[PDB]
Design a protein around this ligand. Structure first.
Ligand SMILES: [Mg+2]
Ligand SMILES: [Mg+2]
Ligand SMILES: [Zn+2]
Ligand SMILES: [Zn+2]
Ligand SMILES: [Zn+2]
Ligand SMILES: [Zn+2]
Lengths: 162, 162
DNA sequence: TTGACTCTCTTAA
DNA sequence: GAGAGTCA
DNA sequence: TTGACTCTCTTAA
DNA sequence: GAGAGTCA
């Protein structure tokens, strides 16, 4: 809600609840042929999810608290960042999973960045393969690699140059 | 419906029309601190665009030809790839700009690949900065770089480990 | 047969 | 990646 | 007050 | 990144 104290109370109650979610170990590519280990705190697959949590989409949840007799509600991964600017360079800030695991609510696996920065981590070579993200990736992006391009650049005639 | 010869004729008429688009020289980052040059064949900003071309969205166009009294229409960048498979790994193939310039219709700046592969080129370090795309990028992706993350991973208490 | 508009849709963050 | 409404 | 559902929306390829 | 309709 409005005051700084109330926002801190929201963050603390969220952390305490998420801190009781099952801790699931995931071994992940780091880039550079190296592997690491992440510990994701995973929201349950089905209700009940935890105090204050409800599922609004297949992989979307919201956190809800009653403050000053009014219901306040946030996207479930946005709560750690409630004291941060909600935009950057005129772009909305989004919760962004460094572990690329939407059920995870570990705030040590989340950052707060534009949707473009968020998306781009999907292709990052990873912290041991050349990640240049200022807020460093925890793993190589799941979509990193050569791709599966069906056809490359080509012309039939002689009208074009690169 | 349309024979291989008729499809080749469509591709040829498309190339002949696009080849007359204004050719714009762009200096571009290649990665590795190097600069290169791309020559984009840019569809006009407003009608008329060229024989067979019409705008269906702010940065969307279609190519239309009528053959044996039947109207055929294609996305304007898909025409070079009409003799190629249209899906791969269960994913639809998309026209993908290697120059990241949607108005460009130079077929030497296009490839044909999944939407994920397409998107990922936005963050590629480029052909001189570590591109691993099997069909190599022509330039560093426009969104490559350290990003502008507002807040990184953090917790207030001690409930979490990474 | 053609141009210049109109509309809505897909994907996965 | 989001916000908000309907019920119990 | 809290839980468990429902719906549609944003972005930029 | 897409497909399709209307009108003259
Ligand atoms: Mg993400
Ligand atoms: Mg693209
Ligand atoms: Zn995680
Ligand atoms: Zn990274
Ligand atoms: Zn181009
Ligand atoms: Zn590349």
């Amino acid at each position: 809600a409005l005051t700084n104290a109330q926002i801190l109370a929201v963050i603390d109650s969220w952390e305490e609840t998420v801190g009781q979610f099952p801790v699931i170990t995931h071994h992940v590519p780091l880039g550079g042929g190296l592997q690491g280990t992440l510990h994701c705190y995973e929201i349950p697959l089905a209700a009940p999810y935890g105090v204050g949590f409800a599922k609004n989409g297949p992989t979307r949840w919201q956190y809800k608290r009653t403050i000053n007799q009014v219901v306040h509600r946030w996207g479930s991964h946005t709560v750690p960042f409630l004291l941060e600017p909600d935009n950057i360079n005129g772009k909305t800030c989004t919760a962004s999973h460094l572990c690329h695991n939407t059920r995870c609510h570990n705030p040590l696996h989340l950052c707060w960045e534009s949707l473009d920065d968020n998306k781009g981590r999907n292709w990052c070579p990873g912290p041991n393969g050349g990640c240049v993200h200022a807020v460093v990736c925890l793993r190589q992006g799941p979509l990193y690699g050569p791709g599966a391009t069906v056809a490359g650049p080509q012309q039939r005639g002689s009208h074009f140059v690169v």
